[PDB]
Amino acid sequence: GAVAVCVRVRPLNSREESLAQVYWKTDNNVIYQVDGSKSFNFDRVFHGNETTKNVYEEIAAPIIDSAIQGYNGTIFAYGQTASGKTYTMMGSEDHLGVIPRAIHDIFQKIKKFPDREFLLRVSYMEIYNETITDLLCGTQKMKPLIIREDVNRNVYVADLTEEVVYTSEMALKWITKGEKSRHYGETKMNQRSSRSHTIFRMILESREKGSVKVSHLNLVDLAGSERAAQTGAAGVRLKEGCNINRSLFILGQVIKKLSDGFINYRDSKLTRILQNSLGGNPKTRIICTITPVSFDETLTALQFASTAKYMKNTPYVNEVS
Ligand SMILES: Nc1ncnc2c1ncn2[C@@H]1O[C@H](COP(=O)(O)OP(=O)(O)NP(=O)(O)O)[C@@H](O)[C@H]1O
Ligand SMILES: [Mg+2]
Ligand code: NA
Ligand code: NA
Ligand code: NA
């Protein structure tokens, strides 16, 4: 249970219906090529009519449980542009994503431990064109942030704000504030493409009401692979795509090296800041989002998700003074 990988297949979108061959079909564990021999097995495959409540309760809720018990937990959404990462991780008021569901779930679950005092604090950062910025601190205080390595060789983002929250409502208002500064852009593939990697973090601390359990819960919505022939991107949008594709290539190389056996975490800000999530001291989950009418991008995503199944994390309960 240190590392687990699932797939989420979305329904077809407006763009795909205006066209498309279905390359992929699924059951709850296997995604297989329609008129070919390729197949991939996962601990869970979600189909197009399964909701983000199903994804949340099966994949994320146990990671929230482990965070309350003092384990670091990280959930990544990975997949091609317009495959469903932001839909799954953030969603909307109409149908909540993993991030807002985790907030409600945390505030409800900590009431089961009245003999424990909880302190919760949130951070929200973006990695855009290999620059790290604080989405919470408001525009006038935004600046490129530095990754440092502390006395225990833990990596951290220097001067990233951490906001104490006492209600679900307060946490959700911080997410809203951060979303205002997040980089989005219009392409032919997604009218609201995520042009950066985003990391929503909760630090959960608890102690007996009478030592302190500390968990970092990192909920990560990656940018997605994209091609100029599909996006019609030019100028800054096209530059963003190049940067995104480069960063995902590096994440795949780090995952491949971990699966085999030194590890090139330093080649991207994303692999450096989440090094502890990739072979380290946390429980990591990967939600691989795919569209079934893609062959090459879906194949790349399934091969990444397959390789990540073999990543060896060694999580333990984090207890300090
Ligand atoms: N499971 C789903 N069910 C229904 N609609 C979905 C689903 N997944 C995605 N969508 C739709 O597809 C749109 C684009 O999905 P979105 O999550 O923004 O893509 P993405 O993977 O985040 N792409 P990008 O940020 O460009 O790399 C959403 O706004 C929804 O309309
Ligand atoms: Mg997105
Ligand atoms: Na097959
Ligand atoms: Na087959
Ligand atoms: Na990027």
Coordinates of C-alpha atoms and ligand atoms in Angstrom, one line a residue, residues 8-11 13 47-48 50 52 79-88 182 184 187 189-190 192-195 221-226 289, ligand 1:
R8 CA -9.8 7.1 -15.0
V9 CA -11.4 6.9 -18.5
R10 CA -13.6 9.9 -19.3
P11 CA -16.5 10.1 -21.6
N13 CA -16.0 15.5 -25.3
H47 CA -15.1 4.1 -16.4
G48 CA -16.8 7.1 -18.0
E50 CA -18.1 6.5 -12.5
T52 CA -15.3 11.8 -8.7
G79 CA -2.5 12.4 -18.4
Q80 CA -2.7 14.1 -21.8
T81 CA -4.2 17.7 -22.2
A82 CA -8.1 17.5 -21.8
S83 CA -7.9 14.0 -20.3
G84 CA -9.6 15.0 -17.0
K85 CA -6.8 15.9 -14.4
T86 CA -8.4 19.2 -13.3
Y87 CA -11.9 17.8 -13.6
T88 CA -10.8 15.0 -11.2
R182 CA -3.1 30.1 -11.4
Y184 CA -4.7 28.7 -17.5
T187 CA -6.0 25.8 -26.9
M189 CA -7.7 20.8 -27.0
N190 CA -8.8 22.6 -23.8
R192 CA -9.0 26.0 -19.9
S193 CA -5.8 24.1 -20.1
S194 CA -3.6 24.1 -16.9
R195 CA -0.4 25.8 -18.2
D221 CA -2.6 18.5 -10.6
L222 CA 0.0 18.1 -13.3
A223 CA 0.1 19.9 -16.7
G224 CA -0.5 17.4 -19.6
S225 CA 1.3 16.3 -22.8
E226 CA 0.1 18.2 -25.9
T289 CA -6.6 10.2 -16.8
Ligands
LIG1 N1 -14.8 12.3 -16.1 C1 -15.3 13.3 -16.8 N2 -16.7 13.4 -16.9 C2 -17.2 14.4 -17.6 N3 -16.5 15.4 -18.2 C3 -15.2 15.3 -18.0 C4 -14.5 14.3 -17.3 N4 -13.1 14.5 -17.3 C5 -13.0 15.7 -18.0 N5 -14.2 16.2 -18.4 C6 -14.5 17.3 -19.3 O1 -13.3 17.7 -20.0 C7 -13.0 19.0 -19.7 C8 -11.5 19.2 -19.7 O2 -11.0 18.4 -18.6 P1 -9.7 18.9 -17.7 O3 -9.7 18.2 -16.4 O4 -9.7 20.4 -17.7 O5 -8.4 18.5 -18.5 P2 -6.9 18.4 -18.1 O6 -6.6 16.9 -18.0 O7 -6.9 19.1 -16.7 N6 -6.1 19.0 -19.3 P3 -5.0 20.2 -19.2 O8 -5.0 21.0 -18.0 O9 -5.0 21.0 -20.5 O10 -3.6 19.4 -19.2 C9 -13.7 19.3 -18.3 O11 -13.8 20.7 -18.2 C10 -15.0 18.5 -18.5 O12 -15.9 19.1 -19.3

